[PDB]
Amino acid sequence: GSFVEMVDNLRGKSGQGYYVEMTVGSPPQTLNILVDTGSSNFAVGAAPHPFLHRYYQRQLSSTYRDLRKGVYVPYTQGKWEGELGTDLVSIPHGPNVTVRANIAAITESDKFFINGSNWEGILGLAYAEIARPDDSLEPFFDSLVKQTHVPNLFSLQLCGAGFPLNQSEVLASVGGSMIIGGIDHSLYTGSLWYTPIRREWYYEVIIVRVEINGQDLKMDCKEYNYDKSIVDSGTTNLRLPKKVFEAAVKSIKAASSTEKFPDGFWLGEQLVCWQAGTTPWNIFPVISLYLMGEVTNQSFRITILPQQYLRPVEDVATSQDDCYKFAISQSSTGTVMGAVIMEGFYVVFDRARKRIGFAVSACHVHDEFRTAAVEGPFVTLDMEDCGYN
Ligand SMILES: NC1=N[C@]23CC[C@H](NC(=O)c4cccc(Cl)c4)C[C@@H]2[C@@H](COC3)S1
C-alpha cells in the first residue's frame, strides 16, 4: 500500500547518478551511496581523495571486520581498487534494520569519484554472480534479505527534473524513491506490466521489438539483445548494440529532419540549445521497446519521449537557453536501459518472483500532447529466439 518513510529518499540526476543515504560502522558514519542495479559490490571511499568530502574510516569503527582480501575492479571508463571487510550498515530512510554486510573499502581509484557528484560509494544491487572478486562475496541486498524480514523485492522511482540543476539545487531537490521491500502505489499511474528476469546475474531482460514513431526498426530481434539486455541505474544513457544504434540513429534523424544537427550531437558529445521554452519536442520521435511478457506469446511495450532521451545540461556559455545532450549511445556489451529510460517509469525489481515490472512514472517529464506509456498485451511468437547464447 504505502511505505511513507522511504518516499523521497533519493537525490541526484541522470548525469551524476542517483544516491541514497547510508550509515556504516559503530558509531554510524554517514555516506551517500550510488544506487546501482548494474553491479553487485557495496563499495565505499575509504581514504582521502580530492573529490570526496568524507569517507569510511575503519579504525573508528569498533564493529569493523577485516576480511584480509584485496579486490581489483577495472572497467572501460574507470576503475577502483580496495580492501574487503564487513561492518554494520543501515539505511536511515529505509526499513528499521541494521545488518552485517560486506564492504569493499576503496583505497585507490581512477575516473570513479567525479568532481562534486555528491556520492562517496556505490550500492551494487545485482546478483552474486557478477560480484568481485567472485560470487562467494554476498551482495548487500542478499545480506539484508537473509538477516531480516524484508521481502525479496525493491522498486525505483528515479525523477529527472526536465532542466538543469546547479549543485545547491541538486542537494536540495528530491530525486526519487527507492522502496526497499515493497511497491508504493503513489509513484506510478496505470498498471504494472512484468517482464521475466532471464538470468540472475545482471538484471537481464529480453527485447522483442523496437519502434520509432510506430515504425518497426525491423531488425532480427537477436540484435536487440546482443549480447545481453539489462536494466541498469548506474549507467546514464540508453545504450544500444552498434547495429541497433546505427539503425535507430538513422530513424531518429529521418523523423526529426526538419532541423539538422552537428554529428557531434548524435555521438552524444556536444549539446544543442534552443531559446527558452521553444524546444521542438514534437519533431523528435517516440521510442517503444517491446519486452517479453509473463504469459506465453504475449509481450508489452514501454514508450519513451524525447523528454527522456534528450538529457538537460547547463549551457557552455551563460544563457537562458534550454540545452540538451543526446542520451542514446553505442554499446559493445549489449542493450543497457540506463537512468534516462528509467526516469520515465516506476521500475519494480521483483527478485522473489524473478521479474521486473514497469509502470508510467508519476514524476516523468512530458508535454501537453504526449506522455510515456506502458501498454499491452501484444501477440508475439518465438520470443525465446530473441535471447542470445
Ligand atoms: N552499472 C555500472 N556500475 C559501475 C559503477 C558505477 C559507474 N557509474 C558512475 O560512476 C555513474 C556516473 C554518472 C552517472 C551514473 Cl548513472 C553513474 C559505472 C560502472 C560501470 C561498470 O560497473 C561498475 S556500469
Q: Which of 142, 232, 322, 350 is an active site residue?
A: 232
Q: Specify whether the CB–CB gap between 364 and 344 falls below 8 A.
A: yes
- Residue that the C-alpha cell 569503527 belongs to: 61
CB atoms within 10 A of CB 1: 8
CA dist 238 and 245 (Å) reads 10
Q: Is 142 a catalytic residue?
A: no
**Interatomic CA distance for residues 283 and 124, integer angstroms:** 38
> What's the CA gap between 339 and 237, in Å, rounded?
6
Q: Which residue has the cell 506469446?
A: 297
Amino acid at 202: Y
What residue owns the CA closest to ligand 1's atom 22?
39
Cα angle 125, 129, 135 (rounded to 5 degrees) comes to 100
Residues with C-beta less than 6 Å from any ligand 1 atom: 16-17, 36, 38-39, 75, 122, 232, 234-236, 339
Task: Please state, as a whole number, how many other Cβ atoms lie within 10 Å of the Cβ of residue 198.
Answer: 20
Classify strands 29-36 and 121-124 as parallel, antiparallel or unpaired: parallel
Contact predicate 35/10, CB 8 Å: yes
Q: What is the 3-state secondary structure (H, E, C) of the chain?
A: CCCHHHCCCEEEECCCEEEEEEEECCCCEEEEEEEECCCCCEEEECCCCCCCCCCCCHHHCCCCEEEEEEEEEEECCEEEEEEEEEEEEECCCCCCCEEEEEEEEEEEEECCCCCCCCCCEEEECCCHHHCCCCCCCCCHHHHHHHHCCCCCCEEEEECCCCCCCCHHHHHHCCCEEEEECCCCHHHEEEEEEEEECCCECCEECCEEEEEECCEECCCCCCCCCCCCEEECCCCCCEEEEHHHHHHHHHHHHHHCCCCCCCHHHHCCCCCEEECCCCCCHHHCCCEEEEEECCCCCEEEEEEECHHHHEEEECCCCCCCCEEEEECEEEECCCEEECHHHHCCEEEEEECCCCEEEEEEECCCCCCCCCCCEEEEEEECCCCHHHCCC
Closest of 327, 377, 354, 339 to residue 208, by C-alpha: 377
Residue 15, CB half-sphere, CA atoms under 13 Å: how many? Answer: 19
Q: How far apart are alpha carbons 306 and 322 in whole angstroms? A: 14
Is the preceding omega at residue 133 within 30 degrees of 0, hence cis? yes
* Distance (Å) of CA 263 to CA 71, 267, 309, 324, 357: 40, 6, 17, 14, 36
Q: Are 140 and 36 in contact (CB under 8 A)?
A: no
CA nearest 152: which of 368, 385, 350, 387?
350
Query: What kind of experiment solved this structure?
Result: X-ray
Whole-angstrom distance, CA of residue 271 vs CA of residue 266: 10
Please give the number of the atom of ligand 1 that sits closest to the Cα of 339: 16
The ligand 1 atom at the shortest distance from the C-alpha of residue 18 is 16
Quote the CA–CA distance of 53 and 177 in Å, as a whole number: 24
**Residue 107 CA neighbour count, 13 Å, CB half:** 10
User: Relative to the CA of 112, which ligand 1 atom is closest?
Assistant: 10
Q: How far is CA 154 from the centre of its chain?
A: 13
The CA-based dihedral angle spanning residues 271, 274, 276, 281, taken in that order and rounded to the nearest 10 degrees: -100
Q: Determine the residue of 19, 33, 36 to mutate for testing ligand 1's pocket, defined as the one with the most ligand atoms within 8 A of the Cβ atom.
A: 36
Instruction: Specify the resolution in Å.
Output: 2.3
Atom number in ligand 1 closest to CA 338: 16
Output the CA 276–ligand 1 centroid distance in Å: 32
Size (the chain), residues: 389
**Domains observed in the chain:** 18-150 (2.40.70.10), 151-389 (2.40.70.10)
Q: Who contacts 57 (Cβ-Cβ below 8 Å, separation ≥6)? A: 25, 29, 46
Q: Whose CA is nearest to atom 6 of ligand 1?
A: 234
Which of 34, 44, 125, 236 is the best mutation target for the ligand 1 pocket, counting ligand atoms within 8 Å of the beta carbon and taking the most?
34
CA–CA distance, 56 with 239 (Å, rounded to integer): 33
Catalytic residue among 36, 87, 142, 321: 36
Q: How many CB atoms lie within 10 A of CB 317?
A: 8
Among 17, 43, 36, 182, which residue's Cα sits nearest to residue 101? 43
